[PDB]
Curated annotation (Swiss-Prot), chain B:
Xref: PROSITE patterns: UBC_1, UBC_2
CDD domains in UniProt: UBCc_UBE2N
Species assigned in the record: Homo sapiens
Stated name of the protein: Ubiquitin-conjugating enzyme E2 N
Cross-link (Glycyl lysine isopeptide (Lys-Gly) (interchain with G-Cter in ISG15)): 91
Length: 192, 151
């Protein structure tokens, strides 16, 4: 089986930088959650990153034709938060700055151990945000990268963010996460 | 609002940074329509062809599924005479959680590997199953006729 707590040790035992840290963990989870590296199922991958970081276990995320099993309902239950402006990038802002400015909005609204679903450009893409007390760990277990704005290849922390790129932080209740842990969609997903 | 940023974003990447082997152009009169072109995959019976597809985004998209159909005739077990595509995620498996990019990638994958598990019985499907070799000769010929010198 797989124990996230233990993976955090091996990762913490390494004096890696913030972004380099997220990337490696996401890359680790990616090999299990989304073994094909395929596209289309980011929503499910992000949800699964969340489950894993909440202690629910690590399961293969649904592939494209399984997304409607549970994700259609999730999407409706959070339409209000997805269809909003969210955090918009500043002109001439770099990826590292934008990332930091987004993590701030998250720390200032969540507690340790918590996680969030992060929608990029109103559900064009999805990644998960995990609070660890001090910093936030942006995870994209679909392609195994850290923070990104739906980038074919992870960009430099110095790269410029395209004008008014938006990101919506999605607060998901424990009731929502538990309802999924009980669904048959979650239970039919391969463990680890 | 209707996720205005998502529509703008998906449209933007389809027009600027599409999946390799796929390209598009906006419809001069209606902004909800897109003229898509997919290259026949190398090593497939459609290699060398350029297939036209019509992508339409209904009012309720993404709650409502996007509409895609071939505008170029093709001999494929999963595409009918009117160019309708038998793809689960374009029908009852679509979800607002999905993306337009997923649909195009699947259609493209369909060209390199026709899906045999299709409940819709049709003459072309039967021949691909029963007479694969003859079916492939036919597909290559239809590619040379409909999918070449057509753009």
């Amino acid at each position: 089986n797989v124990n996230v707590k233990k993976l955090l040790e091996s990762l913490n035992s390494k004096s890696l930088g913030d972004m380099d840290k997220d990337s490696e963990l996401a890359a680790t989870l990616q090999k299990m959650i989304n073994p094909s590296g395929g596209d289309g199922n980011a929503s499910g991958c992000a949800l699964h990153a969340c489950m894993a970081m909440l202690g629910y276990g690590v399961r293969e995320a649904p592939v494209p034709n399984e997304i409607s099993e549970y994700m259609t309902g999730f999407f409706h239950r959070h339409l209000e938060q997805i269809d909003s402006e969210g955090i918009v990038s500043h002109p001439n802002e770099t990826y590292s700055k934008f990332r930091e400015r987004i993590a701030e909005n998250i720390l200032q609204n969540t507690s340790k151990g918590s996680v969030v679903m992060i929608s990029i450009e109103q559900a064009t893409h999805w990644i998960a945000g995990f609070n660890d007390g001090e910093k936030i760990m942006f995870l994209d277990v679909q392609t195994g990268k850290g923070f990104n704005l739906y980038d074919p290849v992870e960009k430099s922390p110095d790269a410029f963010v395209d004008e008014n790129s938006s990101v919506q932080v999605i607060h998901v209740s424990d009731q929502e996460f538990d309802h999924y842990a009980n669904s048959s969609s979650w239970k039919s997903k391969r463990l680890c | 609002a209707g996720l205005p940023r998502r529509i703008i974003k998906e449209t933007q990447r389809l027009l600027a940074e599409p999946v390799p082997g796929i390209k598009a152009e906006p419809d001069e009169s209606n902004a909800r329509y897109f003229h898509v072109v997919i290259a026949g995959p190398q090593d497939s019976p459609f290699e060398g062809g350029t297939f036209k597809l019509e992508l339409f985004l209904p009012e309720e998209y993404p709650m409502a599924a996007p509409k895609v159909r071939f505008m170029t005739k093709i001999y494929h077990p999963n595409v009918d005479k009117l160019g309708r595509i038998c793809l689960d995620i374009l029908k009852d498996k679509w979800s607002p959680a999905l993306q337009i990019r997923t649909v195009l990638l699947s259609i493209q994958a369909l060209l390199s590997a026709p899906n045999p598990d299709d409940p819709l019985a049709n003459d072309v499907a039967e021949q691909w199953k029963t007479n694969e070799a003859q079916a492939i000769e036919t597909a290559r010929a239809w590619t040379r006729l409909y999918a070449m010198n057509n753009i």
